[PDB]
PDB file of C-alpha atoms in Angstrom:
ATOM      1  CA  UNK A   1      11.884  -3.659  -9.397  1.00 22.01           C
ATOM      2  CA  UNK A   2      11.170  -2.913  -5.727  1.00 25.79           C
ATOM      3  CA  UNK A   3      13.726  -4.834  -3.588  1.00 27.47           C
ATOM      4  CA  UNK A   4      14.668  -2.071  -1.143  1.00 26.51           C
ATOM      5  CA  UNK A   5      13.913   0.209   1.798  1.00 23.95           C
ATOM      6  CA  UNK A   6      11.527   3.123   1.277  1.00 22.54           C
ATOM      7  CA  UNK A   7      10.167   6.058   3.317  1.00 24.47           C
ATOM      8  CA  UNK A   8       6.616   7.342   2.810  1.00 23.67           C
ATOM      9  CA  UNK A   9       6.433  11.171   2.847  1.00 24.06           C
ATOM     10  CA  UNK A  10       2.850  12.038   1.732  1.00 24.20           C
ATOM     11  CA  UNK A  11      -0.670  10.787   0.894  1.00 18.83           C
ATOM     12  CA  UNK A  12      -3.712  12.533  -0.669  1.00 18.75           C
ATOM     13  CA  UNK A  13      -7.320  11.993   0.606  1.00 20.11           C
ATOM     14  CA  UNK A  14      -7.376  10.655   4.209  1.00 19.21           C
ATOM     15  CA  UNK A  15     -10.826  12.198   4.898  1.00 17.53           C
ATOM     16  CA  UNK A  16     -12.869  10.977   1.909  1.00 19.20           C
ATOM     17  CA  UNK A  17     -11.003   7.660   1.745  1.00 22.08           C
ATOM     18  CA  UNK A  18     -11.287   7.143   5.503  1.00 23.18           C
ATOM     19  CA  UNK A  19     -14.979   8.128   5.605  1.00 22.44           C
ATOM     20  CA  UNK A  20     -15.685   5.235   3.223  1.00 20.59           C
ATOM     21  CA  UNK A  21     -12.894   2.975   4.548  1.00 18.25           C
ATOM     22  CA  UNK A  22     -14.640   3.237   7.971  1.00 19.30           C
ATOM     23  CA  UNK A  23     -12.310   4.133  10.896  1.00 17.07           C
ATOM     24  CA  UNK A  24     -13.374   5.872  14.178  1.00 15.87           C
ATOM     25  CA  UNK A  25     -12.716   9.611  14.442  1.00 17.33           C
ATOM     26  CA  UNK A  26      -9.634   9.533  16.702  1.00 20.02           C
ATOM     27  CA  UNK A  27      -7.981   7.022  14.357  1.00 21.05           C
ATOM     28  CA  UNK A  28      -8.865   9.225  11.362  1.00 20.49           C
ATOM     29  CA  UNK A  29      -7.552  12.385  13.001  1.00 21.65           C
ATOM     30  CA  UNK A  30      -4.151  10.922  13.955  1.00 22.56           C
ATOM     31  CA  UNK A  31      -3.760   9.081  10.620  1.00 22.42           C
ATOM     32  CA  UNK A  32      -3.541  12.470   8.791  1.00 22.58           C
ATOM     33  CA  UNK A  33       0.249  11.941   8.648  1.00 21.42           C
ATOM     34  CA  UNK A  34       1.222   9.238  11.131  1.00 19.67           C
ATOM     35  CA  UNK A  35       4.449   8.708   9.214  1.00 23.41           C
ATOM     36  CA  UNK A  36       5.447   5.289   7.986  1.00 22.43           C
ATOM     37  CA  UNK A  37       8.655   3.517   6.846  1.00 21.17           C
ATOM     38  CA  UNK A  38       8.103   1.037   3.990  1.00 23.30           C
ATOM     39  CA  UNK A  39      10.250  -1.807   2.646  1.00 22.05           C
ATOM     40  CA  UNK A  40      10.118  -4.648   0.089  1.00 20.58           C
ATOM     41  CA  UNK A  41      12.057  -7.881  -0.596  1.00 18.99           C
ATOM     42  CA  UNK A  42      11.799 -10.358  -3.520  1.00 19.49           C
ATOM     43  CA  UNK A  43      12.837 -14.009  -3.986  1.00 18.59           C
ATOM     44  CA  UNK A  44      12.341 -15.358  -7.567  1.00 15.64           C
ATOM     45  CA  UNK A  45       8.871 -14.040  -8.486  1.00 15.08           C
ATOM     46  CA  UNK A  46       7.617 -14.038  -4.866  1.00 11.42           C
ATOM     47  CA  UNK A  47       7.354 -10.523  -3.410  1.00  7.12           C
ATOM     48  CA  UNK A  48       7.397  -9.771   0.334  1.00  9.18           C
ATOM     49  CA  UNK A  49       6.021  -6.269   1.033  1.00  9.44           C
ATOM     50  CA  UNK A  50       6.036  -4.427   4.380  1.00  8.53           C
ATOM     51  CA  UNK A  51       4.643  -1.038   5.549  1.00  8.79           C
ATOM     52  CA  UNK A  52       5.035  -0.241   9.287  1.00 10.13           C
ATOM     53  CA  UNK A  53       3.489   2.586  11.363  1.00  8.94           C
ATOM     54  CA  UNK A  54       5.868   3.132  14.353  1.00  8.90           C
ATOM     55  CA  UNK A  55       2.693   2.543  16.385  1.00  5.98           C
ATOM     56  CA  UNK A  56       1.828  -1.106  17.077  1.00  6.94           C
ATOM     57  CA  UNK A  57      -0.234  -1.424  13.877  1.00 10.15           C
ATOM     58  CA  UNK A  58       1.400  -2.473  10.582  1.00 11.11           C
ATOM     59  CA  UNK A  59       0.262  -3.360   7.026  1.00 11.64           C
ATOM     60  CA  UNK A  60       2.407  -6.352   6.001  1.00 11.19           C
ATOM     61  CA  UNK A  61       1.642  -8.403   2.872  1.00 11.77           C
ATOM     62  CA  UNK A  62       3.219 -11.180   0.803  1.00 11.70           C
ATOM     63  CA  UNK A  63       2.290 -12.200  -2.747  1.00 11.67           C
ATOM     64  CA  UNK A  64       3.369 -13.748  -6.053  1.00  8.17           C
ATOM     65  CA  UNK A  65       3.344 -12.192  -9.520  1.00  7.55           C
ATOM     66  CA  UNK A  66       0.652 -13.860 -11.635  1.00  9.06           C
ATOM     67  CA  UNK A  67      -0.724 -16.973  -9.950  1.00 10.83           C
ATOM     68  CA  UNK A  68      -2.822 -15.671  -6.975  1.00 11.82           C
ATOM     69  CA  UNK A  69      -2.596 -14.086  -3.494  1.00 11.22           C
ATOM     70  CA  UNK A  70      -4.678 -12.786  -0.579  1.00 10.80           C
ATOM     71  CA  UNK A  71      -4.522  -9.367   1.151  1.00 15.62           C
ATOM     72  CA  UNK A  72      -5.629  -8.092   4.604  1.00 14.62           C
ATOM     73  CA  UNK A  73      -4.951  -4.361   4.546  1.00 17.85           C
ATOM     74  CA  UNK A  74      -6.330  -2.505   7.606  1.00 18.76           C
ATOM     75  CA  UNK A  75      -8.143  -5.165   9.667  1.00 20.48           C
ATOM     76  CA  UNK A  76     -11.087  -7.604   9.485  1.00 22.82           C
ATOM     77  CA  UNK A  77     -11.155  -7.159   5.670  1.00 20.95           C
ATOM     78  CA  UNK A  78      -9.365 -10.163   4.225  1.00 21.18           C
ATOM     79  CA  UNK A  79      -9.502 -10.152   0.397  1.00 18.55           C
ATOM     80  CA  UNK A  80      -8.572 -12.412  -2.508  1.00 19.51           C
ATOM     81  CA  UNK A  81      -6.612 -10.911  -5.426  1.00 23.11           C
ATOM     82  CA  UNK A  82      -4.798 -11.921  -8.642  1.00 22.98           C
ATOM     83  CA  UNK A  83      -1.721  -9.696  -8.452  1.00 24.26           C
ATOM     84  CA  UNK A  84      -0.392  -8.915 -11.948  1.00 27.34           C
ATOM     85  CA  UNK A  85       2.625  -6.934 -13.190  1.00 27.67           C
ATOM     86  CA  UNK A  86       2.777  -4.953 -16.458  1.00 27.63           C
ATOM     87  CA  UNK A  87       5.749  -2.778 -17.496  1.00 27.27           C
ATOM     88  CA  UNK A  88       7.902  -1.940 -14.436  1.00 24.73           C
ATOM     89  CA  UNK A  89       4.756  -1.486 -12.328  1.00 25.04           C
ATOM     90  CA  UNK A  90       2.893  -3.978 -10.069  1.00 25.21           C
ATOM     91  CA  UNK A  91      -0.916  -3.922  -9.823  1.00 20.35           C
ATOM     92  CA  UNK A  92      -3.326  -5.737  -7.506  1.00 21.55           C
ATOM     93  CA  UNK A  93      -7.114  -5.852  -7.679  1.00 19.94           C
ATOM     94  CA  UNK A  94      -9.598  -6.870  -4.931  1.00 20.78           C
ATOM     95  CA  UNK A  95     -13.424  -6.755  -4.453  1.00 22.27           C
ATOM     96  CA  UNK A  96     -13.032  -3.474  -2.496  1.00 23.33           C
ATOM     97  CA  UNK A  97      -9.325  -2.610  -2.259  1.00 19.19           C
ATOM     98  CA  UNK A  98      -7.568  -1.934  -5.547  1.00 18.00           C
ATOM     99  CA  UNK A  99      -3.853  -1.273  -4.993  1.00 20.97           C
ATOM    100  CA  UNK A 100      -0.735  -0.669  -7.090  1.00 22.50           C
ATOM    101  CA  UNK A 101       2.938   0.220  -6.779  1.00 22.58           C
ATOM    102  CA  UNK A 102       5.492   1.682  -9.170  1.00 18.34           C
ATOM    103  CA  UNK A 103       9.180   2.658  -9.506  1.00 17.47           C
ATOM    104  CA  UNK A 104      10.152   5.750 -11.559  1.00 19.06           C
ATOM    105  CA  UNK A 105      12.938   8.384 -11.429  1.00 20.11           C
ATOM    106  CA  UNK A 106      14.609   6.455  -8.574  1.00 20.20           C
ATOM    107  CA  UNK A 107      11.453   6.943  -6.466  1.00 17.94           C
ATOM    108  CA  UNK A 108       8.600   4.656  -5.411  1.00 13.49           C
ATOM    109  CA  UNK A 109       5.093   5.822  -6.426  1.00 13.76           C
ATOM    110  CA  UNK A 110       1.995   4.048  -5.070  1.00 14.51           C
ATOM    111  CA  UNK A 111      -1.816   4.151  -4.842  1.00 14.24           C
ATOM    112  CA  UNK A 112      -4.793   2.607  -3.101  1.00 14.58           C
ATOM    113  CA  UNK A 113      -8.357   2.887  -4.418  1.00 18.07           C
ATOM    114  CA  UNK A 114     -11.890   1.728  -3.574  1.00 19.77           C
ATOM    115  CA  UNK A 115     -14.247   2.044  -6.547  1.00 18.90           C
ATOM    116  CA  UNK A 116     -14.622   5.842  -6.559  1.00 22.14           C
ATOM    117  CA  UNK A 117     -12.299   7.507  -4.034  1.00 23.37           C
ATOM    118  CA  UNK A 118      -8.552   7.164  -4.710  1.00 25.59           C
ATOM    119  CA  UNK A 119      -5.621   7.581  -2.319  1.00 24.64           C
ATOM    120  CA  UNK A 120      -2.578   8.377  -4.418  1.00 25.42           C
ATOM    121  CA  UNK A 121       0.627   8.321  -2.360  1.00 29.99           C
ATOM    122  CA  UNK A 122       4.378   8.716  -2.924  1.00 31.20           C
ATOM    123  CA  UNK A 123       7.644   7.576  -1.357  1.00 27.93           C
ATOM    124  CA  UNK A 124      11.431   8.085  -1.223  1.00 28.50           C
ATOM    125  CA  UNK A 125      14.094   5.364  -1.572  1.00 26.75           C
ATOM    126  CA  UNK A 126      17.043   4.713   0.789  1.00 25.75           C
ATOM    127  CA  UNK A 127      19.094   1.661  -0.237  1.00 28.09           C
TER     128      UNK A 127
END
């Protein structure tokens, strides 16, 4: 039930996640809260997701419910994944990039996780 604009206003664990994720120090330090606008669109059961740092970099993805998709989150780490959806909550699972998203209380809740360290994150809606 995404289909809308979203703003991201907080994350939790950009030091432990990033240590393992593997970014150089300057990138880690600025990421602390380089703010991001997020947005999603859907056709029938084909989702089109989009997170955008104002900076040149962006994390755009596109995937189907059920069936199968591929992800390339930060860079040089293409994955394969069988997105599924259960309740009003999408999940995705990858060799080393679990991810999920959720709608509750007219808000968008979201996570990313890597077999040990999690990176819960939350977002506002604006459409």
